[PDB]
Amino acid sequence: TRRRAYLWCKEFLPGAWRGLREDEFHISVIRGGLSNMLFQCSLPDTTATLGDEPRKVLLRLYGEAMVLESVMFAILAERSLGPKLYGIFPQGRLEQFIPSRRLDTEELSLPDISAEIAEKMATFHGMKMPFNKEPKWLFGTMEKYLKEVLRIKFTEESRIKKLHKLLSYNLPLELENLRSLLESTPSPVVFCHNDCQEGNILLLEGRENSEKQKLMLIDFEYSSYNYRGFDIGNHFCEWMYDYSYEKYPFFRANIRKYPTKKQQLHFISSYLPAFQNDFENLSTEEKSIIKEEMLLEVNRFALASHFLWGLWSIVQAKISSIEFGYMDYAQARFDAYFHQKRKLGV
Amino acid sequence: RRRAYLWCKEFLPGAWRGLREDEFHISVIRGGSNMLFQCSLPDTTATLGDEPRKVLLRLYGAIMVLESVMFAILAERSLGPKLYGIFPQGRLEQFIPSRRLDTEELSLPDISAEIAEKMATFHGMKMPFNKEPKWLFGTMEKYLKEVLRIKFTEESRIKKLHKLLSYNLPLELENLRSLLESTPSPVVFCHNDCQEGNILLLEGRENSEKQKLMLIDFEYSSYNYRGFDIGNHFCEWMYDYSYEKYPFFRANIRKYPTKKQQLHFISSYLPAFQNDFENLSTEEKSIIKEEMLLEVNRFALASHFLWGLWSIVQAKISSIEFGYMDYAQARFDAYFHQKRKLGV
């Protein structure tokens, strides 16, 4: 693996990289795993660059999808909305290394942080991409996962019991009820991230005192044309889930951590002028009509966030070997789904 | 045909998204592996915003990530047709009102000067692809391997191949290896197929001296020796692929650029490619040029060899009505003629 990494960096990267020896190669693990492993690759600090080649890069090893992912990543790189792309090959890619950390769950609620996520998401949403513009993604995905879910058979008792509790809700009928609520909820179709969680938002080192330009959104692998309401509602759902809990089930869920109407309004108040550059010049009461209906829009689409990820999580409980309480997480999402219906009175 | 309506309806914005099937228009441009079409809105329909009134559909036919990433990158940089949609069966691209150049137009001073400048621009780009120049001989070794094992059923083809194999193609490749390894040439991002048929003359730009053309169809592109891209383009001055009768090409060795015409090309290329060249002395400029002439005339030998070999393989597998074996023989004849000229 060291040898393979060396060879990619040597052949894809220009300048000092082109004549680097194996023994001069510096690599270390950024992330392990069975898929999307990450490595930091660098020049000896004693090595001069010959030009504007990077001193350090990120290697991503994978471990239509591939074609679309790659075209998407390249376009974002060209537009300065994602890491630059230095090299692409069957088994992975080389990207810009961005010194940074990810946001913690508790930081999503900080006013400056949420204001900037809103601005960044709005920008993302206004971009033109060469992808199918028809919003079949949301329900096509849920239908895909539901089919799988109804075929699952566990052998171990605890998983058997957890599954039968979830199935007892009549998921097919419940998905038809959700389709109906969303049928009557107008929402623009935009280019959505679909996974805007803290773990996919970088706090960029050097600018943690910058007020409006300290973040970058990454990991656009679930991205697609989709209802705007899904992206924002999904993001609001993620204020409640903390994935860094060190004991089983490896997440904490807190329903009271969902943004208040006042926190929701602060977010959409940054989103709207960013998406519609003239918005601020509208009559104050058209502004209020817009905001109130959008609030209803995103809180209805938040239900699809629960439903989609709950179903996904049940499929993972069968096919993934990652250490995570997938069945416990699906139940957390379905608990939130029903609570949010009771909140909305639906 | 409803497939095409659906892709345009689904991938294209504005007035395209609410389009009914009975208002959709599609015309052919090239039948057959890369079938070309021309889809458009009704002349009565008004645009809601940006959307193109007309687009080009490309079908991958019989056969992806690299070519698609390349095409997307060139679109973003304004160096290729825009990319409007991408799917497993093809892509929708911007439609550029233009025509291709004719072979004879390659030698016109203003045309030649611009191609040189465009190629220099292509040559300076950074692309996320392998920078080792393994393409040239890797490709030639690959086609040679296929050539040594193919069997024709037709007697004419069997005899044409026999004459070609009689040159001792493996030994001649090693002869070309020693020549080229002794010939320095910088590695750059090469088009690799810069012929008249891949150069657009843009509509309404005919009077522009310096900006009337666009380079297209970068499917063979890779990091490769700069000498190849230039020597290859010089060879293309000799081949006219629009001839109306079998073998569907004309070859003319006398149409290879004179020294004068070659210097005219490189004198436009060089200032456009290396930033410091314009400010060099007359005498350092002439030194670079003379060495560049030796460089590219030598690499032109690889253009005849590679495409001769390629053309033998195509004779086996291609459906296209084209005299592939005769073209292969035309390329090997020019190969040997150019060696005699150069004294190598």
Side-chain angles (χ1 to χ4, degrees), chain A residues 86-98:
Chain A
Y86 292 115
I88 184 111
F89 36 97
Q91 40 285 115
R93 56 174 198 241
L94 298 165
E95 334 164 350
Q96 192 183 1
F97 183 85
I98 313 271

Side-chain angles (χ1 to χ4, degrees), chain B residues 107-152:
Chain B
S107 59
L108 291 169
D110 294 351
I111 301 278
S112 194
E114 189 174 339
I115 290 161
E117 287 166 18
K118 248 52 159 205
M119 180 178 284
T121 307
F122 208 92
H123 285 174
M125 305 191 307
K126 316 180 198 162
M127 299 295 294
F129 303 130
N130 199 307
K131 320 263 178 308
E132 261 292 301
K134 31 181 137 169
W135 184 82
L136 182 62
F137 279 82
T139 312
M140 285 182 302
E141 294 164 13
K142 181 175 78 179
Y143 300 148
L144 208 217
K145 175 172 191 153
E146 296 181 64
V147 167
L148 288 175
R149 80 193 222 260
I150 58 194
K151 290 142 299 203
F152 286 114

Side-chain angles (χ1 to χ4, degrees), chain A residues 12 47 49 61 92 101-102 115 130 141 143 148 186 206 222 261 272 281 285 289 308-309 315 338 341 345:
Chain A
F12 285 81
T47 304
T49 47
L61 219 48
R101 60 162 177 94
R102 287 156 168 81
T141 308
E143 285 165 30
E148 263 258 53
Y222 288 104
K261 183 164 152 175
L272 291 154
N281 301 145
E285 63 285 331
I289 298 287
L308 190 145
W309 296 118
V315 174
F338 293 113
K341 294 172 75 196

Side-chain angles (χ1 to χ4, degrees), chain A residues 259-273:
Chain A
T260 61
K261 183 164 152 175
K262 178 173 173 180
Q263 285 163 330
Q264 300 174 30
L265 279 176
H266 172 80
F267 182 100
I268 73 162
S269 295
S270 315
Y271 183 89
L272 291 154

Side-chain angles (χ1 to χ4, degrees), chain A residues 199-207 209-220 222-276 278-308:
Chain A
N200 289 327
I201 307 176
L202 297 183
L203 177 73
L204 301 172
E205 85 162 39
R207 53 228 320 200
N209 271 263
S210 167
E211 196 203 57
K212 293 174 170 166
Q213 305 291 312
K214 54 182 178 291
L215 307 178
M216 174 180 319
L217 305 182
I218 56 156
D219 280 346
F220 325 100
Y222 288 104
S223 297
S224 72
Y225 280 91
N226 191 13
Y227 310 99
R228 164 182 80 190
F230 181 85
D231 224 14
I232 303 182
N234 183 245
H235 176 66
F236 294 172
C237 288
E238 280 299 339
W239 290 36
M240 309 191 281
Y241 304 108
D242 181 339
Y243 309 109
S244 65
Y245 175 53
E246 323 68 37
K247 306 292 179 181
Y248 189 84
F250 312 101
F251 72 92
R252 287 190 229 264
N254 192 333
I255 294 270
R256 196 178 162 195
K257 294 294 199 185
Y258 194 82
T260 61
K261 183 164 152 175
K262 178 173 173 180
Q263 285 163 330
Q264 300 174 30
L265 279 176
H266 172 80
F267 182 100
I268 73 162
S269 295
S270 315
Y271 183 89
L272 291 154
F275 192 89
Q276 284 213 117
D278 61 82
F279 176 83
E280 227 63 8
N281 301 145
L282 294 176
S283 61
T284 215
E285 63 285 331
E286 191 173 346
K287 282 195 215 165
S288 262
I289 298 287
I290 290 166
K291 285 190 190 174
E292 289 302 323
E293 178 181 334
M294 191 174 267
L295 246 37
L296 292 177
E297 168 195 354
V298 315
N299 284 104
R300 282 185 176 162
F301 281 89
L303 295 167
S305 177
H306 298 306
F307 210 100
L308 190 145

